[PDB]
Design a protein around this ligand. Structure first.
Ligand SMILES: N#Cc1ccc(N/C(=N\CC(=O)O)NC(c2ccccc2)c2ccccc2)cc1
Lengths: 214, 219
């Protein structure tokens, strides 16, 4: 039972520095390399570097020399990576993996978002069919989560009973803020009698909003 | 710098078929110790990558014998003898021999199911939104296959559009179809000056567009 645990999502202003943790458990921390990979949509996976906790010996990919800084605390079984002078090119998902001759166990991923944009809660809007629209064995409803920042909003549907047929659409950037939508499909037999509600959480502004579909 | 070159970048196969991925390095991958450190990873959608195969042909823990690797010199392949929905995801080849370790681009695998027409549904802006001076009109094109689809927006049948956002989901593992949302964003003012709002999608499953509209004065 090997496991690497990383810190949570970050939103940093350009020119700042961030430090991400990778708590390793289940193996002897100092005998294996801790690898750091970078995933940015479009550029695949890019190896950043590696440290050997024990000797504190590091290997850096040239482009990252001066930018990334590995460190490790063997007392705590924790590996650290600092990223200096953040740039937009630094916005990606960073992984820590364990290493010897393979990267056999990977951490969960830590998203770093570098922006000057302030944090914004979303505006949730119910979407119900209009007059002269719906008929059928089922009715599709939805919620429009709009205008939030940074990324990651979770939208849950608490329908009466029969339902699911839930779809969540990837967020997009619109005028510097994100917008996503979710759709659910319940049987008409049950709607509008049984209540349908979408709950939308956005951890960055610590806001959770509910919206009953009317 | 070791360059790994994979092909294809997209790999669609029917369930129960065979897939084959090719990875070609730019130098020999043989280490000073004689072993060749070429590995294969899988990144199921929504997760971190996972070691699938190590040292060309060795199956890691939890990897079914359907997966198999072969290769030598500068030609390495991955064969999946009988695919299924759980195999859905992105495959990466990689070298752990020369520093920096490098990965391939990946090969996204998609399951080739039969064609399915979209279930198009349209929604007018909501009173709450209309209140904030905005007005978005959304259209869901749910459960279709293939992924290729064109959706046109038409305000009063005239104005075709441009302030539209399209978002596709990934293949849905239960039924292997896709779904997208097209959103036409207007201002309360602009919205209030028009009556018909149409959503038209063209998909190969039909000769004619799937049209869905709503009139503000219907009832
Ligand atoms: N994929 C992959 C991958 C991940 C990590 C490593 N690291 C690495 N060390 C780097 C170095 O010494 O500077 N791995 C070394 C190594 C392992 C342990 C201690 C020293 C060296 C190695 C490579 C191949 C076979 C046996 C041992 C090599 C490849």
């Amino acid at each position: 039972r090997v496991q690497l645990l990383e810190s949570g999502a970050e939103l940093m202003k350009p020119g700042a520095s961030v430090q991400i943790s990778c708590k390793a458990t289940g193996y002897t921390f100092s005998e294996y390399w801790i690898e750091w990979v970078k995933e940015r949509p479009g550029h695949g996976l890019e190896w950043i570097g590696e440290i050997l906790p024990g000797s504190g010996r590091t290997n850096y990919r040239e482009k990252f020399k001066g930018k990334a800084t590995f460190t490790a605390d063997t007392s705590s079984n924790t590996a650290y990576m600092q990223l200096s002078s953040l740039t937009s090119e630094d916005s990606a998902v960073y992984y820590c993996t364990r290493g010897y001759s393979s990267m056999d166990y990977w951490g969960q991923g830590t998203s770093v978002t570098v922006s000057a944009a302030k944090t914004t809660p979303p505006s949730v809007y119910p979407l119900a069919p209009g007059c002269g629209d719906t008929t059928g064995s089922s009715v599709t409803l939805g919620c429009l989560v709009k205008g939030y920042f940074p990324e990651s909003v979770t939208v849950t549907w608490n329908s009466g009973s029969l339902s699911s047929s839930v779809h969540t659409f990837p967020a997009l950037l619109q005028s510097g803020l994100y917008t996503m939508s979710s759709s659910v499909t319940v049987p008409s037999s049950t709607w509008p009698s049984q209540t349908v509600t979408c709950s939308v959480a956005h951890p960055a502004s610590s806001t959770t909003v509910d919206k009953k579909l009317e | 710098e070791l360059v790994m070159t994979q092909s294809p970048l997209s790999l669609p196969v029917s369930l129960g078929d065979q897939a084959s991925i090719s990875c070609r390095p730019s130098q020999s991958l043989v280490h000073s110790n004689g072993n060749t450190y070429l590995h294969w990873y899988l990144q199921k959608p929504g997760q971190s990558p996972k070691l699938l195969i190590y040292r060309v042909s060795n199956r890691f823990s939890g990897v079914p014998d359907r997966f198999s690797g072969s290769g030598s010199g500068t030609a390495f392949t991955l064969k999946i003898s009988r695919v299924e929905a759980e195999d859905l995801g992105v495959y990466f080849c990689s070298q752990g021999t020369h520093v920096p370790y490098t990965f391939g681009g990946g090969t996204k695998l998609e399951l080739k199911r039969a064609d399915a027409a979209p279930t198009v549904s349209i929604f007018p802006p909501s009173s709450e939104q209309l209140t904030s001076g905005g007005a978005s009109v959304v259209c869901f094109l749910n459960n279709f296959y293939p992924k290729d689809i064109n959706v046109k927006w038409k305000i009063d049948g005239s104005e075709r559009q441009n302030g539209v956002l399209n978002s596709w989901t990934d293949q849905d593992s239960k039924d292997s179809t896709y779904s997208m949302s097209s959103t036409l964003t207007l201002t309360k003012d602009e919205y209030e000056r028009h009556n018909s709002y149409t959503c038209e999608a063209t998909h190969k499953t039909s000769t004619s567009p799937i049209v869905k509209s709503f009139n503000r004065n219907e009832c």
